[PDB]
Write a protein that binds this ligand. Structure first.
Ligand SMILES: [Mn+2]
Ligand SMILES: [Mn+2]
Length: 363
């Protein structure tokens, strides 16, 4: 219904280390009147999965109720059901894969009875994307238009495929549940074809839970882990992916990692870069790095210090009229400056340019 007059750019961070992993996250409200994103980051899991980890981004719609309940409870719905536990020993590929499906369906029904019982007024829904990381497998999980990727060996090794209504199997399901896809939207309103919650979209008679207008069924992919080649995993809501592609962001994160090992800082840079590339949505990013994540380079740090200083001089020189920040950005862009961060471009450097603009024209 509304945007803010000015963006809420305050970042919320977390970070941790364990099972050979390091992780950082950053969430920001941005231009939207509410923050309806949520996340989960836990290293070491209950009930004998000490050496497992779990990370997840939740993009909530029509309120944050569903997103928040998921962020605190999706994991135990996933690991504490007979499908995940099942077979006598350690959980197999199938156990894990079926366990997540059950987890997804059962928490959905759980939330439906809770809402029915307590007479809930919110009509919210949420995407989930994440990884369950075991000693030898990364299991990617997706439900909605949030997205995850694996950077392996300097390249995009795998990414999750967003559930858009106009996708062929999604459209088919929607049509069979008596709906249509109008442009990109389920009956002209809903932009996503899979989510937790959205219970009004889940009331077709004589169609299973996975056969409704909006499905809670996750897509799960088993990637075998690689001690030598596994570099980092990026999970983010569409607030990020709307304005940056797989290759770009993966190239950009690499560039940043070659400058800091501070993961919260890298995530802040993803989020600011995205706000400046024009994103007007809530943004949340998680960055999980593996032992062979890119390393800090003495040279890349110098190049960044050089580039920073260069951008400071241009600003000072561009001010002879006294142009506003917007106009300085325009001018700087039309200079076609070399060596800007890959993917990030000029946008990834606005905090540096702006801080300087302020040093010189503070009023
Ligand atoms: Mn949202
Ligand atoms: Mn969003």
């Amino acid at each position: 219904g509304a945007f803010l007059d000015k963006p809420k750019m305050e970042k919320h961070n977390a970070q941790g280390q364990g099972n050979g992993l390091r992780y950082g996250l950053s969430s920001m409200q941005g231009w939207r009147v509410e923050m309806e994103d949520a996340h989960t980051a836990v290293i070491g899991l209950p009930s004998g999965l000490e050496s497992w980890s779990f990370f997840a981004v939740y993009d909530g719609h029509a309120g944050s109720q569903v997103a928040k309940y998921c962020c605190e409870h999706l994991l135990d719905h996933i690991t504490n059901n007979q499908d995940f536990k099942g077979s006598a020993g350690a959980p197999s590929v199938e156990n894990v894969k079926n366990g997540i499906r059950t987890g997804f369906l059962e928490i959905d029904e759980h939330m439906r009875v809770m809402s029915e019982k307590k007479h809930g007024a919110d009509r919210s829904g949420s995407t989930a994307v994440g990884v369950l990381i075991s000693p030898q497998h990364t299991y990617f999980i997706n439900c909605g238009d949030s997205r995850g990727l694996l950077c392996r060996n300097r390249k995009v090794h795998f990414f999750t495929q967003d559930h858009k209504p106009s996708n062929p199997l999604e459209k088919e399901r929607i049509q069979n549940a008596g709906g249509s896809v109008m442009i990109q939207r389920v009956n002209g309103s809903l932009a996503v074809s899979r989510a937790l919650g959205d219970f009004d979209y889940k009331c077709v008679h004589g169609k299973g839970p996975t056969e409704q207008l909006v499905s809670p069924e996750p897509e799960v992919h088993d990637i075998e882990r690689s001690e030598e080649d596994d570099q980092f995993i990026i999970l983010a809501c569409d607030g990020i992916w709307d304005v940056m592609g797989n290759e770009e962001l993966c190239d950009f994160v690499r560039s940043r990692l070659e400058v800091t090992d501070d993961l919260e800082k890298v995530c802040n840079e993803v989020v600011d870069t995205c706000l400046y590339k024009g994103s007007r949505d809530n943004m949340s990013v998680i960055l999980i790095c593996f032992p062979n994540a890119p390393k800090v380079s003495p040279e890349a740090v110098k190049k960044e210090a050089e580039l920073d200083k260069y951008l400071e001089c241009r600003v000072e020189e561009i001010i002879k009229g006294v142009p506003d920040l917007v106009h300085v950005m325009r001018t700087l862009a039309s200079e076609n400056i070399p060596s800007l961060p890959p993917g990030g471009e000029l946008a990834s450097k606005r905090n540096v340019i702006e801080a300087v603009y302020n040093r010189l024209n503070p009023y």
